[PDB]
């Protein structure tokens, strides 16, 4: 087949070592390793076959190497194909499929990455203009579908809720030992699952949660992490502010039961909130307290902690093998995205020519894809509005700065079990310390 000259239609320039390179050791379609942006756009809108995986990876990651306005200009340019009888075949097997691929890209862009348009109204103006100029009978159905999407974008049986000492409605008595431990774990799992599910790839690609505009670009991610940090600190606080030893043993024991239920729910964020609290300086040194923890709960906590050993070897295997719903620990994804982006070149060079390194972007898109896969399935659990609100509004730090607060926790640790004879402290809980355990009531 014969195409226009590159001096009229830039996407006609043949492939070469200086244009496109492929992955050499890996659904019938070759894996692009690197290429100029012209070639990447060509293959993104290739006439010989659709390439949904390339489209998804591209639209998830292109902003590191191409700005949204530039991409719109480039796919418009691709669409406007000039002709060089044998034209009938050219129109059938080149113009038509390339233009359909362009509309497919527009459709996926507006559908899954509409945030580009919400942040640049002029981008949306250009897109609606472009779509409006599209006059074709083969195109009409795709054009109408795109317009519809754009218009829309401008706009089983759960178990019984468990109760312990606090009764329904008695918000004022809600606390670590008065709410039922199963229900604490369930409502924290609902909170943390929603927090996990709200995080979008746009907060992650580009490592933007580490940069000076993180608060603007990664608000859901930060809110999620901040909740996790808050719960860890609240667990440590509950422990070291319980100065009576017997009561402290009951507190630590209840927290291990909450951990057990987190494990039952595959809430690994919850597992690690607890594990991080137990590893904290103020808590880890409380030998007189762990002394009285029953050996079964010691084993529960031991298994959970071992999930984090060896750079999370066992956490990773267990996550690979569980079935949803679950709440992954996000920290590992963040490290892998950041180290992938920082540990690989943006550009490869071949024959003095610069080519966008696309494989590093594919690696980042695989990570964000795995996150999304665990955001699909929700938990079959009922919300308890008041328990939910209680955990949303936990604020163990109060007005203190981080250093002041963690120093105060460590000094409480030193006071309740000195480095010095062990003092006695009076009880603070009026109610019974015995746990209802972690099996339901029916």
């Amino acid at each position: 087949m014969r195409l226009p000259s590159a001096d009229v239609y830039r996407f006609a320039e043949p492939d070469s070592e200086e244009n496109i390179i492929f992955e050499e050791n890996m659904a019938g379609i070759p894996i692009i390793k690197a290429g100029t942006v012209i070639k990447l756009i060509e293959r993104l809108t290739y006439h010989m076959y659709a390439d949904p995986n390339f489209v998804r990876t591209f639209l998830t990651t292109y902003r590191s190497f191409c700005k949204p306005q530039e991409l719109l200009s480039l796919i418009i340019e691709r669409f406007e194909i000039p002709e060089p009888a044998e034209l009938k075949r050219f129109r059938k097997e080149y113009i038509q499929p390339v233009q359909l691929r362009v509309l497919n890209v527009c459709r996926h862009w507006v559908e899954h990455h509409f945030y580009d348009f919400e942040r640049d109204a002029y981008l949306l103006q250009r897109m609606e203009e472009f779509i409006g100029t599209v006059r074709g009978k083969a195109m009409k159905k795709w054009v109408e579908s795109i317009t519809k999407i754009i218009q829309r974008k401008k706009i089983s049986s759960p178990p019984t809720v468990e109760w312990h000492i606090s009764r329904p409605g008695h918000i004022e008595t809600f606390d670590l030992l008065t709410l039922h431990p199963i229900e604490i774990a369930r409502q924290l799992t609902l909170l943390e699952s929603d927090l996990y599910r709200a995080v979008q790839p746009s907060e992650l690609v580009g490592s933007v949660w580490t940069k000076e505009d993180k608060e603007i670009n990664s608000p859901n991610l930060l809110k999620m992490i901040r909740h996790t940090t808050n719960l860890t600190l609240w667990f440590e606080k509950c422990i070291v502010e319980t100065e009576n030893l017997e009561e402290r043993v009951a507190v630590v024991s209840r927290i291990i039961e909450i951990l057990q239920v987190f494990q039952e729910l595959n809430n690994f964020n919850g597992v690690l909130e607890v594990v991080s609290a137990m590893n904290s300086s103020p808590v880890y040194r409380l030998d007189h307290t762990f002394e009285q923890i029953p050996s079964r709960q010691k084993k529960i906590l031991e298994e959970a902690h071992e999930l984090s050993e060896d750079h999370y070897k066992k956490y990773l295997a267990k996550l690979r093998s569980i079935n949803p719903p679950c709440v992954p620990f996000f920290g590992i994804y963040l490290t892998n995205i950041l180290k992938t982006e920082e540990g690989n070149p943006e550009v490869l060079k071949r024959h003095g020519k610069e080519l966008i390194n696309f494989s590093k972007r594919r690696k980042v898109a695989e990570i964000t894809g795995e996150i999304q896969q665990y955001q699909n399935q929700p938990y079959c659990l009922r919300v308890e509005s008041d328990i939910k609100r209680f955990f949303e509004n936990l604020n163990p730090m109060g007005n203190s700065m981080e250093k002041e607060f963690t120093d105060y926790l460590f000094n409480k640790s030193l006071e309740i079990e000195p480095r010095k004879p062990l003092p006695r402290f009076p009880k603070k809980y009026s109610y019974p310390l015995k746990s209802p355990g972690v099996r339901p009531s029916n």
Binding site: I225, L272, S280, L334, T335, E342, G343
Partner: protein, 166 residues
């Protein structure tokens, strides 16, 4: 053979990850896949003794502040890292080290101070300043370049010698 658990500690946002990445990459491979064991474990020969460096770098998890103790607890030696173009990251060092000392329950934990130079921003931390801080802690100072790999090996090897001579 002996395995050393090293932990990288430092402010986020200033490319501290380059120190460990550059150590692990063969000197001329720019690939890095952080999802495999070879990505944080390296066998090396130091002063004629062969050993295995296991390096924990949580770069990217800085917001999980209540996990620092947990991660620090895993190490026997620590690289405290700041960017030489970022004064705030140099100021953060003192509190990081306080925290390492409390986590390990010891006033002299094997540790090294590392100033890291990224390609193109301008120095705001003079080498004398860092040299003086490190002497005040009784620990070595190493400067590294993320562009050239200069100093990287020296940084990790000095830390291993601090562990061996402890």
């Amino acid at each position: 053979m002996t395995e050393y658990k090293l932990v990288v500690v430092g402010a986020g946002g200033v490319g501290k990850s380059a120190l460990t990445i550059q150590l692990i990459q063969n000197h001329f491979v720019d690939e890095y896949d952080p999802t495999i064991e070879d990505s944080y474990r390296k066998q090396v020969v130091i002063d004629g003794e062969t050993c295995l460096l296991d390096i924990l770098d949580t770069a990217g998890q800085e917001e999980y502040s209540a996990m620092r103790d947990q991660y620090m607890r895993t190490g026997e030696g620590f690289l405290c890292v700041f960017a030489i173009n970022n004064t705030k990251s140099f100021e953060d060092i003192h509190q990081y080290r306080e925290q390492i000392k409390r986590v390990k329950d010891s006033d002299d934990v094997p540790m090294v101070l590392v100033g890291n130079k990224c390609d193109l921003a301008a120095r705001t931390v003079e080498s004398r300043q860092a040299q003086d801080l490190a002497r005040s802690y009784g620990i070595p100072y190493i400067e590294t370049s993320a562009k050239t790999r200069q100093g990287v090996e020296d940084a990790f090897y000095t830390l291993v010698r601090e562990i061996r001579q402890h």
